[PDB]
Amino acid sequence: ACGYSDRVLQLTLGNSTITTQEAANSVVAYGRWPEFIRDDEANPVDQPTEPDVATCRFYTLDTVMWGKESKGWWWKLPDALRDMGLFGQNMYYHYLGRSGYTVHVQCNASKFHQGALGVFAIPEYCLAGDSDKQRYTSYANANPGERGGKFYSQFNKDNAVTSPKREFCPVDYLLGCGVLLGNAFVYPHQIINLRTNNSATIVLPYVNALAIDSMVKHNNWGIAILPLSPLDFAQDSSVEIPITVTIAPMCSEFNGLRNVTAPKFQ
């Protein structure tokens, strides 16, 4: 009658609002909405900071382009937001930090384009390395920030055993970690199938084996976007359309304040 649809949503957090008119409902991972540490689950004893609206708001990462030969993209959280406004500052000034997230992936095209993206949110997304040496990807390479990384179609082993790259080599049909991509659907996910929807919204609780941890040392969630069905349009052979990822911290609390961490990335 007045017209509410699970295809049209507005998300408002802090000073930022997102609208979509072609959603496919939204996922709350494992059925758990984010929340703060309860006193009976608390572990550091100092009073936490809770910046609230200053950090729990939508940050848009740089857009990536989906073309016919794209194999996929991945980001880790909190890493993709390490340089985002006051979320990054609080993350680096405190030994411990905890946060849930709303992830909104945006990709519009037209009624004559086709393709389907799988958007998966993976707890502890360990990725495989590029060489004979095990567990050797370096901190700077494992953590690309908002730039994220990419998937490949095959294992290209780094051979310069002299000046090893120490990078991940995520093969796409193996989900970058030795399992088959088809089973990634056991993880919280949505599909952006261009004939049906133009966005995916997934709410992520904080998941870890601890109530709070070091955000600088450990990524809690990985976001993997892979073309389940490749992009195609009319009869053109080089169609490209943007994919934009907007993520908002939720229920952020931090403990253990001191001087700022300055990681060496370069």
Partner: protein, 235 residues
């Protein structure tokens, strides 16, 4: 000195026994649990989640992202099947590595109903009707739509609801089937045919992928735990 008499079995070690034994670190202060999201209580919960079927294991497609894509097109030969598959969920190579097939490969027997959901990934301007069918075993495997439509089937009309589910009802002589391939406990055949054809207007792709998913229904169970053939270790 309570008089006792030792019976057969004394001093053996059965690896599936269930007995008490002394605690090596007594009075340890265990860390209490916290409420982590995502707790699992039964392995059958994982077999009920749809996972994508590697339907296309042709030469150049197996072990690539293309093993998950079945091509539909407006110029396909309408008399030929789009796909054919046996209902051996832990053994047929298209089903054995799905999450359902990976859990059944740790058990010897399975029973219950299964559901196949197919997703159309063409453009919004593409239309079509597809017949997906299940033939309980014992007759010739369907080679034409005419034979396939005499068994259990769903006619899918493509449209805004993007996906269609066919349920393969439990229809069996034995109360539990084997997870290996055996003709005594064989499960039947799944086939798919065009009911009309994919139709697109001009300036629209004439080919597109279809993706398929499988999961167990709520009446499904497994029994007799066993090791899987899906992992090994060399000396």
């Amino acid at each position: 000195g309570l008089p006792v008499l030792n019976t057969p079995g004394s001093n053996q070690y059965l690896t599936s026994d269930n007995h008490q034994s002394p605690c090596a670190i007594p009075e340890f202060d265990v860390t209490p649990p916290i409420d982590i999201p995502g707790e699992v209580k039964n392995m059958m919960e994982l077999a009920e989640i749809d996972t994508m079927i590697p339907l296309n294991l042709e030469s150049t497609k197996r072990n690539t992202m293309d093993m998950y894509r079945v091509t539909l097109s407006d110029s396909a030969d309408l008399s030929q099947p789009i796909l054919c598959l046996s209902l051996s969920p832990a053994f047929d190579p298209r089903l054995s590595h799905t999450m359902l097939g990976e859990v059944l490969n740790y058990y010897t027997h399975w029973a219950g109903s299964l559901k196949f959901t197919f997703l159309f990934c063409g453009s919004m301007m593409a239309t079509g009707k597809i017949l997906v069918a299940y033939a309980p075993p014992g007759a010739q495997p369907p080679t034409s739509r005419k034979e396939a439509m005499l068994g259990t089937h769903v006619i899918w009309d493509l449209g805004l609801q993007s996906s269609c589910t066919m349920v393969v009802p439990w229809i069996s002589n034995v109360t539990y089937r084997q997870t290996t391939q055996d003709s005594f406990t064989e499960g039947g055949y799944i086939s798919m045919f065009y009911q009309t054809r994919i139709v697109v207007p001009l300036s629209t792709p004439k080919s597109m992928s279809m993706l398929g998913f499988v999961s167990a229904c709520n009446d499904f169970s497994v029994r007799l735990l066993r090791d899987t053939t899906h992992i090994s270790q060399s000396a």
